[PDB]
Ligand binder design. Structure first.
Ligand SMILES: O=C(NO)C1(CSc2ccc(Oc3ccc(Cl)cc3)cc2)CCOCC1
Ligand SMILES: [Cl-]
Ligand SMILES: [Cl-]
Ligand SMILES: [Zn+2]
Ligand SMILES: [Zn+2]
Length: 267
């Protein structure tokens, strides 16, 4: 497809799920060859794996003392829409979580796409690779289309679930929300995270219970969300990606490990 930017500046704002602080974003159009980058306090932070500074419970980027938490959801939306040139100006320390999904970003950006003059140079996975960490595994292999499967093995009523995204089915993952298990919330708070988390932006589950009165958006909403997170982390390769991926229990740390291995291989 063609390289794309946005037709005009787009703004979003709200609390961040980890910092609990209110932040604002301004998405700026950019010319061909710019890539996706964040901008904070005069510093440009490219949306690339070299700038990752944290991967426990979110993917965070930094450069020159400026950090931005929780980039995975906005990057996943930009990857799905194949927006390739944009500056995401952040006034604050984290991307707003909004309702926990990519919906508000997706609906706004999709109506404001500007096609540009050259075609995208995709990051094309050249050969099969497997990355692993303590029972968690991610495999990547060649494909002319982006295809991403996530399989979960939950320690509650959900049990085993799998979901596969293929191109054309973007609408099936952009409404799936971030989620948390009630038994894990104390740890998240104790490590200085989850300060903005609530039932308004997170699907919270117990061993048997669903805390959210509105329930699940889909019976497999958590694995749809994990596919969505992986698509955001894959955009840290620095170009939209063509490959077939399978993640068994992967999280941001393993997703970033895969990206760094693929980037090294194809240097
Ligand atoms: O979506 C994600 N990454 O993008 C995950 C974020 S984990 C995460 C867990 C809990 C939090 O705080 C909360 C504190 C209290 C409440 Cl009531 C609600 C939430 C905040 C964050 C989930 C999928 O696995 C990868 C990590
Ligand atoms: Cl941690
Ligand atoms: Cl994680
Ligand atoms: Zn932790
Ligand atoms: Zn997420």
């Amino acid at each position: 497809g063609l390289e794309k930017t946005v037709k005009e500046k787009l703004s979003f704002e709200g609390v961040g799920i980890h910092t609990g602080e209110y932040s604002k974003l301004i998405i700026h159009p950019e010319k061909e060859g710019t890539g996706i980058r964040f901008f904070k306090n005069g510093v440009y932070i490219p949306a690339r794996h070299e700038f990752v500074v944290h991967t426990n419970h979110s993917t965070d980027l930094g450069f020159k003392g400026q950090r931005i938490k929780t980039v995975e959801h906005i990057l996943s939306v930009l990857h799905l829409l194949e927006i390739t040139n944009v500056t995401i100006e952040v006034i604050g320390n984290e991307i707003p979580i909004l309702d926990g999904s990519g919906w508000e970003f997706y609906e706004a950006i999709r109506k404001n796409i500007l096609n540009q003059n050259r075609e995208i140079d995709y990051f094309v996975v050249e050969e099969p690779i497997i990355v692993e960490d303590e029972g968690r595994l991610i495999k990547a292999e060649p494909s002319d289309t982006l295809e991403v499967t996530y399989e979960g093995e939950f320690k509650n009523f959900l049990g085993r679930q799998k979901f596969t995204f293929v191109e054309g089915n973007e609408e099936e993952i952009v409404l799936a929300r971030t989620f948390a298990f009630d038994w894990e919330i104390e740890h998240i708070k104790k490590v200085g995270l989850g300060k903005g988390g609530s039932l308004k932006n997170t699907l919270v589950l117990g061993k048997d219970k669903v805390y959210n009165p509105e329930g699940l958006r889909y019976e497999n909403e958590p694995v749809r969300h994990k596919v969505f997170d992986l698509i955001g982390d894959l955009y840290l390769l620095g170009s939209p990606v063509k490959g077939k991926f399978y993640s068994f229990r992967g999280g941001h740390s393993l997703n970033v490990k895969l990206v760094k291995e693929l980037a090294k291989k194809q240097k």
